[PDB]
Amino acid sequence: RRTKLVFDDRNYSADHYLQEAKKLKHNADALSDRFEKAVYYLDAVVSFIECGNALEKNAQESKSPFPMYSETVDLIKYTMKLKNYLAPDATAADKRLTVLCLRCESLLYLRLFKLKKENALKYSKTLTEHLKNSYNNSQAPSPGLSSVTIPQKIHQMAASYVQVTSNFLYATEIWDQAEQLSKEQKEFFAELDKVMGPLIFNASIMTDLVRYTRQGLHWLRQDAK
């Protein structure tokens, strides 16, 4: 009854995946039934992730995927606001689709982190030392028996460090969200894990996520369509 997708083992250009995802996103923009709207939005999201993955591993011309993954995260956030999973009459299809969306969003946040992760150790070093090194403007030292002044570069560095750290903070929270929600469709997702191999937080690559989500979408389609 359940069938596994035989996957296209070509590595097309990022432009090809971008056009594919735009076609799917506009199919979804046109549709009126929110569930099929959301299914096609997740299909487009998978193609967008493929476009970013191609921007990364394009052998003879590599560009940056960070805006791609970020805007795709925003697309997933929009998508989840159509068929709310915590709704009273929320079907099993809505819940499984939400779990797939959450997996995609968590892993995309994690990549967004890892694309700029090199800055954060550097910045943690120097920002820890300088934020023990800021004690001014309100109380002078008080020998015994408010507002704070910090250097400009320290401020910009703290801003960028928070910007980079928010990414895995969201990734961790959304991954735990996905884990928890998967308990209410444990059988569906145990079969999916058995067929595809489970998604690993810090290990699964974008192609693993693409194939896993496409398999889940295939089963969701057959259960409704």
Numbering used by the authors: 902 to 1046, 1081 to 1160
What does the paper say about this structure?
To gain a better understanding of the molecular basis by which AFF4 interacts with H3K27ac, we set out to determine the crystal structure of the C-terminal domain of AFF4. However, we did succeed in crystallizing and solving the structure of an AFF4 fragment encompassing residues 900–1163. Surprisingly, the 2.2 Å structure shows an all α-helical homodimeric structure, instead of the predominantly β-sheet YEATS domain-like structure. The ordered portion of the structure, containing residues 902–1160, with the exception of a disordered internal segment from residue 1047 to residue 1080, forms eight α-helices. Helices α5 and α6 are extensively involved in homodimerization. Phe1103, the residue identified to be important for H3K27ac interaction, is located in the middle of α6 and involved in dimerization via stacking with the same residue from another molecule. In consistent with the structural result, AFF4 dimerization was abolished by a rather large deletion of residues 971–1117, but was not affected by the single mutation F1103A in cells. Our structural result contrasts the expectation of a YEATS domain suggested by sequence alignment, and precludes direct participation of Phe1103 in H3K27ac interaction in the present form. 901–1163 domain we crystallized is not competent for H3K27ac binding in our pull-down experiment. Our structural result reveals that the 901–1163 region of AFF4 is a dimerization module, instead of a complete H3K27ac-interacting domain.
